[PDB]
Design an enzyme around this catalytic site. Structure first.
Site, PDB file in Angstrom:
ATOM      1  N   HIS A 178      93.231  -2.822  14.349  1.00 43.68           N
ATOM      2  CA  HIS A 178      93.609  -3.141  15.747  1.00 43.68           C
ATOM      3  C   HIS A 178      92.513  -2.676  16.705  1.00 43.68           C
ATOM      4  O   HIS A 178      92.819  -1.934  17.638  1.00 43.68           O
ATOM      5  CB  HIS A 178      94.959  -2.549  16.083  1.00 43.68           C
ATOM      6  CG  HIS A 178      96.076  -3.157  15.318  1.00 43.68           C
ATOM      7  ND1 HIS A 178      96.702  -2.491  14.306  1.00 43.68           N
ATOM      8  CD2 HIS A 178      96.719  -4.331  15.469  1.00 43.68           C
ATOM      9  CE1 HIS A 178      97.686  -3.230  13.847  1.00 43.68           C
ATOM     10  NE2 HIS A 178      97.712  -4.373  14.539  1.00 43.68           N
TER      11      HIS A 178
ATOM     12  N   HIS B  23      89.808  -7.686  16.355  1.00 47.45           N
ATOM     13  CA  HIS B  23      91.107  -8.331  16.066  1.00 47.45           C
ATOM     14  C   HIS B  23      91.518  -9.226  17.234  1.00 47.45           C
ATOM     15  O   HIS B  23      91.990 -10.346  16.982  1.00 47.45           O
ATOM     16  CB  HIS B  23      92.173  -7.295  15.774  1.00 47.45           C
ATOM     17  CG  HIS B  23      93.557  -7.834  15.882  1.00 47.45           C
ATOM     18  ND1 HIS B  23      94.071  -8.726  14.967  1.00 47.45           N
ATOM     19  CD2 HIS B  23      94.534  -7.577  16.766  1.00 47.45           C
ATOM     20  CE1 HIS B  23      95.313  -8.992  15.291  1.00 47.45           C
ATOM     21  NE2 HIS B  23      95.620  -8.288  16.383  1.00 47.45           N
TER      22      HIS B  23
ATOM     23  N   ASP C 171      96.704  -6.031  22.330  1.00 47.48           N
ATOM     24  CA  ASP C 171      96.740  -4.752  21.546  1.00 47.48           C
ATOM     25  C   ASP C 171      96.009  -3.590  22.247  1.00 47.48           C
ATOM     26  O   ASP C 171      95.635  -2.637  21.542  1.00 47.48           O
ATOM     27  CB  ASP C 171      96.144  -4.932  20.148  1.00 47.48           C
ATOM     28  CG  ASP C 171      97.125  -5.582  19.185  1.00 47.48           C
ATOM     29  OD1 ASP C 171      98.343  -5.247  19.261  1.00 47.48           O
ATOM     30  OD2 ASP C 171      96.665  -6.462  18.382  1.00 47.48           O
TER      31      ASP C 171
HETATM   32  C1  LIG Z   1     106.785  -8.056   1.788  1.00 47.69           C
HETATM   33  O1  LIG Z   1     106.368  -8.221   3.146  1.00 47.69           O
HETATM   34  C2  LIG Z   1     105.167  -7.695   3.565  1.00 47.69           C
HETATM   35  C3  LIG Z   1     105.131  -7.519   4.942  1.00 47.69           C
HETATM   36  C4  LIG Z   1     103.987  -7.012   5.528  1.00 47.69           C
HETATM   37  C5  LIG Z   1     102.868  -6.699   4.771  1.00 47.69           C
HETATM   38  C6  LIG Z   1     102.884  -6.878   3.391  1.00 47.69           C
HETATM   39  N1  LIG Z   1     101.725  -6.484   2.651  1.00 47.69           N
HETATM   40  C7  LIG Z   1     100.371  -6.623   2.928  1.00 47.69           C
HETATM   41  O2  LIG Z   1      99.496  -6.629   2.064  1.00 47.69           O
HETATM   42  C8  LIG Z   1      99.976  -6.865   4.284  1.00 47.69           C
HETATM   43  C9  LIG Z   1      99.683  -7.364   5.352  1.00 47.69           C
HETATM   44  C10 LIG Z   1      99.559  -7.780   6.731  1.00 47.69           C
HETATM   45  C11 LIG Z   1     100.466  -7.296   7.681  1.00 47.69           C
HETATM   46  C12 LIG Z   1     100.378  -7.681   9.027  1.00 47.69           C
HETATM   47  C13 LIG Z   1     101.384  -7.119   9.978  1.00 47.69           C
HETATM   48  N2  LIG Z   1     102.442  -6.599   9.448  1.00 47.69           N
HETATM   49  N3  LIG Z   1     103.408  -6.157  10.310  1.00 47.69           N
HETATM   50  C14 LIG Z   1     104.795  -6.119   9.762  1.00 47.69           C
HETATM   51  C15 LIG Z   1     105.199  -7.483   9.197  1.00 47.69           C
HETATM   52  C16 LIG Z   1     104.910  -4.981   8.751  1.00 47.69           C
HETATM   53  C17 LIG Z   1     103.154  -5.755  11.624  1.00 47.69           C
HETATM   54  O3  LIG Z   1     104.065  -5.413  12.359  1.00 47.69           O
HETATM   55  C18 LIG Z   1     101.721  -5.826  12.102  1.00 47.69           C
HETATM   56  C19 LIG Z   1     101.544  -5.728  13.628  1.00 47.69           C
HETATM   57  C20 LIG Z   1     101.864  -7.008  14.319  1.00 47.69           C
HETATM   58  C21 LIG Z   1     101.855  -8.178  13.714  1.00 47.69           C
HETATM   59  C22 LIG Z   1     101.662  -8.366  12.242  1.00 47.69           C
HETATM   60  C23 LIG Z   1     101.117  -7.123  11.504  1.00 47.69           C
HETATM   61  C24 LIG Z   1      99.380  -8.571   9.419  1.00 47.69           C
HETATM   62  C25 LIG Z   1      98.483  -9.071   8.491  1.00 47.69           C
HETATM   63  C26 LIG Z   1      98.560  -8.693   7.148  1.00 47.69           C
HETATM   64  O4  LIG Z   1      97.679  -9.127   6.192  1.00 47.69           O
HETATM   65  C27 LIG Z   1      96.344  -9.407   6.617  1.00 47.69           C
HETATM   66  C28 LIG Z   1     104.048  -7.368   2.783  1.00 47.69           C
HETATM   67 MG   LIG Z   2     100.238  -5.508  18.568  1.00 45.95          MG
HETATM   68 ZN   LIG Z   3      97.591  -8.059  17.326  1.00 39.73          ZN
END
Ligand SMILES: COc1cccc(NC(=O)C#Cc2cc(C3=NN(C(C)C)C(=O)[C@@H]4CC=CC[C@H]34)ccc2OC)c1
Ligand SMILES: [Mg+2]
Ligand SMILES: [Zn+2]
Length: 333
Positions: A84, A88, A125
């Protein structure tokens, strides 16, 4: 709010981006970063070019100088964290440009709304510390207490909106100084609504509202415009898996490092550490990315393309091929 110097601007304007088409869906920001010893000046120059080539600042009385002041006031307020950082929000800015102009989402919004979306990308961000909302609440840190006492669970998103408003109150960096009455109000309301909507806690409810509105030929027009802006900034924010595989992969490594550091501080502070934030769990990237694709990004992009945004079909095509590429890493391990 110290004013931007003649010298700081010159440092950006001199960057020329030989080889790069910043409007292209296959633009590589990683290649542009180590393509000089001034990766920060280049990112700023990518944003400057994106904003000027849209033609929108001109139409709204934002000079080239004020526009670049703004880019640079935004850049000063991001931090050396692995994900972040300023790279980004420049990525989200360029990606939103591709969704608007290659995906033809521009047809759904006014020029003011397209201008707002590109600007919001850069503020969404601000002053991110590499820790999620959840960290601040579980640790009863000052910001978390303040959010909890105020009744707003979106800790970071409200911090970001606060610094956006700080930057825009100095006419020297107000990209909206050219607006008055209803237009200036719509610009601020919509920049704020969009940033607040990037909180993944509201992901399901923002996605379902957008789809309910698109399916309804009698949706309120203003409400539909607004939900379209929110869905596009959300789309930009989870766009890493829509990029060419090696780009997707470097994003994924950067986000994993940031999550792992949060896991280190949550341990040293003795609070709950999720499996995903634990370095000593060494979970496979491949299974991570496939999980993200299956549960968040594939259903998101598929549903919005089908509902309304047909021009963004390529995003669904790329997620399919990124998934199969991860399945191949698994099949050959
Ligand atoms: C089983 O569900 C999962 C869920 C999440 C991750 C993974 N595993 C990974 O390898 C990763 C990634 C990953 C994660 C994010 C984000 N995640 N989040 C939540 C969904 C936990 C956030 O709030 C971040 C802040 C705002 C927006 C999106 C951002 C963004 C990009 C990613 O990849 C490049 C497996
Ligand atoms: Mg954010
Ligand atoms: Zn963002």
């Amino acid at each position: 709010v110290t004013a931007i110097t003649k010298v700081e601007r010159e440092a950006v304007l001199v960057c020329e981006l030989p080889s790069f088409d910043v409007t292209d869906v296959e633009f590589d920001l990683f290649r542009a970063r180590e393509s000089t010893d001034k990766p920060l000046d280049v990112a700023a120059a990518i944003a400057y070019r994106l904003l000027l080539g849209s033609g929108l600042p001109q139409k709204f009385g934002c000079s080239d100088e004020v526009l670049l002041n703004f880019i640079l006031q935004c850049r000063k307020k991001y931090r050396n964290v692995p994900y972040h950082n300023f790279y980004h929000v420049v990525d989200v800015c360029q990606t939103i440009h591709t969704f608007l102009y290659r995906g033809n989402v521009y047809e759904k919004l006014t020029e003011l709304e397209c201008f707002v979306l590109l600007i919001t990308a850069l503020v969404h961000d601000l002053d991110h510390m590499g820790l999620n909302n959840s960290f601040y609440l579980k640790t009863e840190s000052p910001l978390g207490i303040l959010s909890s006492a105020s009744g707003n669970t979106s800790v970071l998103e409200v911090h970001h909106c606060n610094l956006a408003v700080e930057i825009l109150s100095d006419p020297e960096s107000d990209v909206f100084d050219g607006l008055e009455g209803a237009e200036r109000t719509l610009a601020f309301r919509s920049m704020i609504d969009c940033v607040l909507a990037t909180d993944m806690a509201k992901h399901g409810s923002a996605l379902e509202a957008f789809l309910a509105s698109a399916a309804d030929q009698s949706s309120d027009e203003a409400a539909f415009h607004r939900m379209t802006m929110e869905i596009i900034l959300k789309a930009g924010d989870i766009s890493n898996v829509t990029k060419p595989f090696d780009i997707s992969r470097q994003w994924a490594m950067a986000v994993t490092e940031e999550f792992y550091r949060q896991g280190d501080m949550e341990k040293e502070r003795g609070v709950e550490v999720l499996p995903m934030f634990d370095r000593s769990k060494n979970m496979e990237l491949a299974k991570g990315q496939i999980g993200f694709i299956d549960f968040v990004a594939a259903p998101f992009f598929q549903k919005i393309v089908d509902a309304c945004l047909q021009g963004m079909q390529w995003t669904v095509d790329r997620i399919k091929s990124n998934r199969a590429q991860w399945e191949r890493v698994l099949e050959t391990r």
